[PDB]
Design a protein around this ligand. Structure first.
Ligand SMILES: *[C@@H]1O[C@H](CO)[C@@H](O[C@@H]2O[C@H](CO)[C@@H](O)[C@H](O)[C@H]2NC(C)=O)[C@H](O)[C@H]1NC(C)=O
Ligand SMILES: *[C@@H]1O[C@H](CO)[C@@H](O[C@@H]2O[C@H](CO)[C@@H](O)[C@H](O)[C@H]2NC(C)=O)[C@H](O)[C@H]1NC(C)=O
Ligand SMILES: *[C@@H]1O[C@H](CO)[C@@H](O)[C@H](O)[C@H]1NC(C)=O
Ligand SMILES: *[C@@H]1O[C@H](CO)[C@@H](O)[C@H](O)[C@H]1NC(C)=O
Ligand SMILES: *[C@@H]1O[C@H](CO)[C@@H](O)[C@H](O)[C@H]1NC(C)=O
Ligand SMILES: *[C@@H]1O[C@H](CO)[C@@H](O)[C@H](O)[C@H]1NC(C)=O
Ligand SMILES: *[C@@H]1O[C@H](CO)[C@@H](O)[C@H](O)[C@H]1NC(C)=O
Lengths: 119, 168, 48, 48
């Protein structure tokens, strides 16, 4: 526990403290070792409607690392653990197959950032 | 009671021996306390019991065996109820068997909460307040962790769902 | 002294839906302490 | 295992079941815990 917690970070869930373990410090105790665990816990959850794939041209994109999250007006991609909204673009997505097969999909725009720089 | 039995004369000799009589009882009690602690550690992983969502839709995954049945008494799932039949345990003379701090019924609720927690909130419940997520979407995250891209799950969810259902 | 039936926790069902997701907007860093024994007194008893 | 496998996916190989690990569902038995492990295995292969 000390070797994983003090040196390095442990991916194992709940092995060291509760929640994600950023780092740990150990304090000597009589006939014992005490470990203080620093962990990250997400306090607030704002409800957002979500869908797995967005179909732009009959090809559906998926997030490189972010669950698609939409307030309901527009669709932006944010990291699943903190709410950062980024305008969906080719850089944050990859397209595989045709958008007929995926069970849940929402039509949405793509920015194509090369075009405004070109024009 | 075991060694001397009911007779008073037998008891007096036991007193001569010492705290052996007293020491043995203490050791057993320590063992008895430990059993409760083990069960507590293993199953009390959740702060709050999570009721299963009324909607049974889980993107084509059938969880009927795993989840608790309201119609059935004792709130034990079909897989769980089958298991109880498999292992069957089947006072007398100074030996007493004490019932578990957690009643089998209570243990059932803890298991359901974890099951309910896993399906509804993924791994979010383990590390903090449970966050609702689509089950298909949760599975998508799971594939990513093992190196198979999320799109792969979505492309043939139906194939995957059938295999899982068949496997269960 | 009163004897209760030992309720395990508050019963809340997280809202669930195929199209509904929840994502955290703020985070809290906390410190938790776990205590493990590493040693006990060493006693040597001469048997004689 | 309960903490490690039910709550989150376990990276450690063979820690849960056999093969790649997706998720686990806890079960209750008399004086025991029965774990159901969901794992991903590759069924078919080709040379390249
Ligand atoms: C999920 O679980 C089982 C397997 O498909 C189905 O439940 C069956 O329901 C019918 C009556 O509707 C009963 O005849 C069977 O007893 C049930 N199965 C068994 C094995 O007993 C259920 O239909 C499946 N899914 C849903 C969505 O209901
Ligand atoms: C995140 O939560 C933290 C902690 O509650 C917030 O920090 C507080 O913000 C209020 C209002 O600005 C301050 O008056 C307090 O001094 C801050 N500290 C605490 C402990 O309350 C923070 O504002 C929240 N972040 C977001 C982005 O809303
Ligand atoms: C998210 O879900 C609820 C559903 O009752 C919604 O009304 C509200 O915006 C949020 N509150 C929650 C999960 O408590
Ligand atoms: C996303 O929704 C919020 C809440 O309705 C709104 O304030 C915000 O403007 C939306 N995003 C954009 C780009 O408008
Ligand atoms: C979500 O589930 C509801 C159940 O009422 C259904 O009407 C709807 O078509 C489903 N949508 C998706 C995208 O699965
Ligand atoms: C998305 O666009 C397709 C045609 O490309 C159309 O069939 C579909 O109904 C649209 N759906 C929504 C729900 O906006
Ligand atoms: C790759 O090579 C072997 C050679 O014996 C061939 O028979 C087969 O196509 C491939 N092998 C496996 C092991 O699938």
């Amino acid at each position: 526990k000390m070797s994983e917690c003090v040196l390095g970070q442990s991916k194992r869930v709940d092995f060291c403290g509760k929640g994600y373990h950023l780092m740990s410090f150990p304090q000597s105790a009589p006939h014992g070792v005490v470990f203080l665990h620093v962990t990250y816990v997400p306090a607030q959850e704002k409800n957002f409607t979500t869908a797995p794939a967005i179909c732009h041209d009959g090809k559906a994109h998926f997030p490189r690392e972010g669950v698609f999250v939409s307030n309901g007006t527009h669709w932006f991609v944010t990291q699943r653990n903190f709410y950062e909204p980024q305008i969906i673009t080719t850089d944050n997505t990859f397209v595989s197959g045709n958008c007929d097969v995926v069970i849940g999909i929402v039509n949405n725009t793509v920015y194509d950032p090369l075009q405004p720089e070109l024009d | 009671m075991y060694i001397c039995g009911d007779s008073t004369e037998c008891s007096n000799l036991l007193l001569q021996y010492g705290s052996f009589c007293t020491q043995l009882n203490r050791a057993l009690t320590g063992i008895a306390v430990e059993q409760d602690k083990n069960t507590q550690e293993v199953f009390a992983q959740v702060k709050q019991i999570y009721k299963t969502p009324p909607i049974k839709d889980f993107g084509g995954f059938n969880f009927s065996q795993i989840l608790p049945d309201p119609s059935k008494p004792s709130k034990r799932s079909f897989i769980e109820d089958l298991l109880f039949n498999k292992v069957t345990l089947a006072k007398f003379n100074g030996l007493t068997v004490l019932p578990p701090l957690l009643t089998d019924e209570m243990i059932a609720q803890y298991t359901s909460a974890l099951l309910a927690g896993t399906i509804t909130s993924g791994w979010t419940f383990g590390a903090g307040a449970a966050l609702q997520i689509p089950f298909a979407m949760q599975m998508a995250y799971r594939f990513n962790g093992i190196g198979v891209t999320q799109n792969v799950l979505y492309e043939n969810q139906k194939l995957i769902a059938n295999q899982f259902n068949s496997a269960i | 002294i009163i004897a209760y039936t030992m309720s395990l926790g508050a019963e809340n069902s997280v809202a669930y839906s195929n199209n509904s997701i929840a994502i955290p907007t703020n985070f809290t860093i906390s410190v938790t302490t776990e205590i493990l024994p590493v040693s006990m007194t060493k006693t040597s008893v001469d048997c004689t």
